[PDB]
């Protein structure tokens, strides 16, 4: 089997991407944030505290003939930006782009933090990290990908995110028309539950490539590219007027600037992020200070190849017995 679903930016900045997912019988379609940096499929639901729902589409398990309470199971998750959610658990039939898993754990939110309430476009998350990160207790649950894997033609999914444009998540096959050149595969450590890999270096604009190992995670659920302070300083030093602002929370630059590209290494190959992908627009409405798409990982504890990096590439999440990551230009 295979599946193929279109993923769409939630706003004009590509702050996140939503993909329609069918849950239950008859189908209830929710727009979920596919997140290779977490392992819980959770949804706004008929159980979410009413004051914490503001325009989201909700899953109502009582209207699904295939929903079953996962008795006694609860979940609770905290994210890197300080947001969080928690609740109870059902199992139900879940379909993504034509690919169906029966008995998938669907984590129903009873509580969500303010940032989730305030984003009416995201109805929940679909976790695609390793199932060892799943927060369901007392019986840990598997991701949609792990449950689908044995049925897939090939044990893979791919992320082809667009820049201010739709893109595609495919399950079970590699669309050879979706990328240029060849796919460069690189080793993955699963020890922290993430798609954790090591980039081979970077270049700023037309500068000479610096060979240096940069461990990080491939995270479709993170907006920006978070890298060591040395790398990020070298990038922003090339932009007139750029500076790090503690009041804003990162590097800002004059909105009048044209940004240099940023290249990252994957083995001996190179992925080029165009400068425009690094522009996240005014820090506040009408400001002439713009927020940068490359930021320091210093506050985080881990480097994150988020959407800014991933949307420049066709990315293969290879869930074979030894997992690997593939990157191709596109």
């Amino acid at each position: 089997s295979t599946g193929s679903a279109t993923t769409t930016p939630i706003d004009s900045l590509d702050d996140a991407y939503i993909t329609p997912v069918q849950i239950g019988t008859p189908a209830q379609t929710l727009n979920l944030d596919f997140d290779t940096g977490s392992s819980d499929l959770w949804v706004f639901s008929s159980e979410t505290t009413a004051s914490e729902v503001d325009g989201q589409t909700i899953y109502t398990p009582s209207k699904s003939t295939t929903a079953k309470l996962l008795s006694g199971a609860t979940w609770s998750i905290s994210y890197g930006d300080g947001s969080s959610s928690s609740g109870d658990v059902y199992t139900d039939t879940v379909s993504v782009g034509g690919l169906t898993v029966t008995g998938q754990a669907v984590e129903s939110a009873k509580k969500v933090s303010s940032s989730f309430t305030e984003d009416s476009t995201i109805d929940g998350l679909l976790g695609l990290a390793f199932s060892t990160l799943n927060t369901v207790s007392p019986t840990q649950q598997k991701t949609f990908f792990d449950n689908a894997k044995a049925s897939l033609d090939s044990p893979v999914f791919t992320a082809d995110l667009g820049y201010h444009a739709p893109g595609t998540y495919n399950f079970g096959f590699i669309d050879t028309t979706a990328y240029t050149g060849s796919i460069t595969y690189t080793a993955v450590s699963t020890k922290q539950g993430f798609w954790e890999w090591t980039s081979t270096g970077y270049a700023v604009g037309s500068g000479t490539f610096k060979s240096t190992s940069i461990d990080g995670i491939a995270d479709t659920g993170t907006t920006l590219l978070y890298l060591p302070a040395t790398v990020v300083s070298a990038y922003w030093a090339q932009v007139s007027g750029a500076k790090s602002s503690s009041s804003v929370g990162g590097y800002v630059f004059p909105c009048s600037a044209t940004l240099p590209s940023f290249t990252f290494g994957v083995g001996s190959a190179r992925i080029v992020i165009p400068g425009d992908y690094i522009d996240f627009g005014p820090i506040s409405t009408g400001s002439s200070s713009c927020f940068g798409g490359i930021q320091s990982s210093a506050g985080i504890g881990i480097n994150i190849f988020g959407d800014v990096a991933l949307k420049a590439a066709f990315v293969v999440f290879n869930g074979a017995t030894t997992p690997t990551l593939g990157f191709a230009s596109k």
């Binding site: 996140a16 940096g37 977490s38 994210y79 985080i300 504890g301």
Partner: peptide
């Protein structure tokens, strides 16, 4: 930005 399970 958002940063998804730290």
């Amino acid at each position: 930005x958002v940063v998804x399970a730290x």
